[PDB]
Amino acid sequence: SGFRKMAFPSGKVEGCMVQVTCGTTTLNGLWLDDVVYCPRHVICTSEDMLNPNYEDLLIRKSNHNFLVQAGNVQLRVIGHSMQNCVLKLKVDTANPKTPKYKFVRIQPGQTFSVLACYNGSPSGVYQCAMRHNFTIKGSFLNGSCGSVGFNIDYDCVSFCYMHHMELPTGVHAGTDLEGNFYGPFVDRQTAQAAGTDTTITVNVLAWLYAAVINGDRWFLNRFTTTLNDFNLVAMKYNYEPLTQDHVDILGPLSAQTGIAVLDMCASLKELLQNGMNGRTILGSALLEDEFTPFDVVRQCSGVTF
Amino acid sequence: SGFRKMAFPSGKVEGCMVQVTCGTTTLNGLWLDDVVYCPRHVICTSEDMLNPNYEDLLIRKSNHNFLVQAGNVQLRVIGHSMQNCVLKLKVDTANPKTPKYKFVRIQPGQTFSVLACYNGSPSGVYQCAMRHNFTIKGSFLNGSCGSVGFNIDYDCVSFCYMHHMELPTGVHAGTDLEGNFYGPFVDRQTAQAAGTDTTITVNVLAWLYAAVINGDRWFLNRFTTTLNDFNLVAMKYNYEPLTQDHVDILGPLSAQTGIAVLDMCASLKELLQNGMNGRTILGSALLEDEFTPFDVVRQCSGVTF
């Protein structure tokens, strides 16, 4: 047993990471088949960043202005196009290590692994979640742009995230792989504010179920509640409202433990109102909301890829 | 910026994971060159586990009793030997995907990434630390045995951990890759008890430095202290005594921030004595101790592999 913030194995994704340079700017790209994907702002110089006209900057460019490097090797760029906020560079070599893959758009509350990259090399791997203000709480430095987030389902890699920018308070914003930002953000260097964030209620409940599965059960009381009486307390704490769909999703965990979802809600209601008082749950002093139900199940049963 | 529990990219290690079966027992093995490593208790049946005589069990075995499977493929076992608590199975094929690697014995306080595996397939990756009682706080299920822990330096994989067992309170114990247990544990099914754990003081200080680097500075006060006055408070909280070697190790972080180590100690002294009072540091409500100074530097500067 035990319970950890767990990321997917990053192997299939490491073999797709390359370095892309255009003039003065080096960042990361994603090489699948004969196409490299990277943030379109690789074509900007630090002056252009205030309000770049990207199509203007782009026409001024030709195939050989983009240096794509795959480790030791140099790839040949035989075409380029721009889709929303990503650059598509057609190269002459298909990536032999391309995995089976899809491009997915995730929704607020869902989680994914991030492979943090610098100069086409992977630096480290960590798990995080799309928040309700469409930011993520990442760990990104200069040169991390173009790093990607992903999930795995048996052998297929689902790419959901490409990293573009840092926002006030050290949170991060990026796009899906078709180049559309999550949230109301733009790839220009102007003042941008992330909205207010809410705790992902359904994920907190899933993590409470994981604690029970693992032996930590001191927080279980003997009351029950309704959705309305729960939502009434939850929203005075900026928890996301719980819906009947959320109850349904937690069904399997409720089954595995024998604890009805609305009883677990009663335990959470009393946790919110009365605090932890120095106790921890699964080694944490806070209520962890970056485990989805499907994460808890995946880790507590042993799903491999 | 930002700061996450970050694991190493697991690619180089995924290509070394295989499934080993012997009679009734399937677990994981580590395939480097023409040798597969796995826990010697793969040769035990559930009745032998109370007090196995391993050399007796082992002589009763022959090369073909060990089924080694590398994904789709079956490997042929042309020899076997036992070193302390690991089994060495010589196979007829060298692993083409073997990375540059070493076997290292890690000390209490040091960290490493764990690639959690089931039936030779990787399930997930997470970071953890060798505790001062020689346990680790892992996430391991039935069939996880033989999963390994590792670090990376440039291109070389340092293997430090092979997983063997669960102990009371859901902590875990295993060996280095030469088959010697960390701590006073044995691979028999008898009552074994993890000892008293201490907080890794030098790592807490490193994480406080990471918070400052990332703009979380509310806990900084304006006092200083000495080693003795710090150790006096720390040991009243089961923190590990801080030594002059520990001060020295934190030098670089102290340099990068401009905050002397003994001033940061004064901030920690007041954190211990006065608690967080509902504030968080880098998103946590507890004092994190599973980031070494190297880790903080690694993540806040962008070291790639």
Ligand SMILES: *[C@](O)(C(=O)NCc1ccccc1)[C@H](C[C@@H]1CCNC1=O)NC(=O)[C@H](CC1CC1)n1cccc(NC(=O)OC(C)(C)C)c1=O
């Ligand atoms: C990303 O472009 C990147 O990695 N580029 C390669 C590179 C950048 C700098 C030096 C060498 C190589 C960065 C990633 C950022 C940088 C630090 N941590 C990150 O997540 N993204 C940007 O720099 C981004 C450009 C996007 C298109 C508009 N950018 C530009 C200007 C300002 C900010 N953010 C900012 O000012 O942060 C606050 C907190 C508001 C001060 C920005 O993300």
Ligand SMILES: *[C@](O)(C(=O)NCc1ccccc1)[C@H](C[C@@H]1CCNC1=O)NC(=O)[C@H](CC1CC1)n1cccc(NC(=O)OC(C)(C)C)c1=O
């Ligand atoms: C490991 O051997 C393994 O994965 N074996 C393959 C396998 C086991 C069971 C079913 C199918 C396939 C396990 C890993 C354990 C199991 C669950 N989580 C883990 O980390 N290691 C053991 O089972 C271990 C054998 C080691 C040589 C002595 N073992 C045996 C008997 C008891 C325990 N622990 C235990 O009883 O835990 C407490 C908390 C004390 C109840 C044990 O780890």
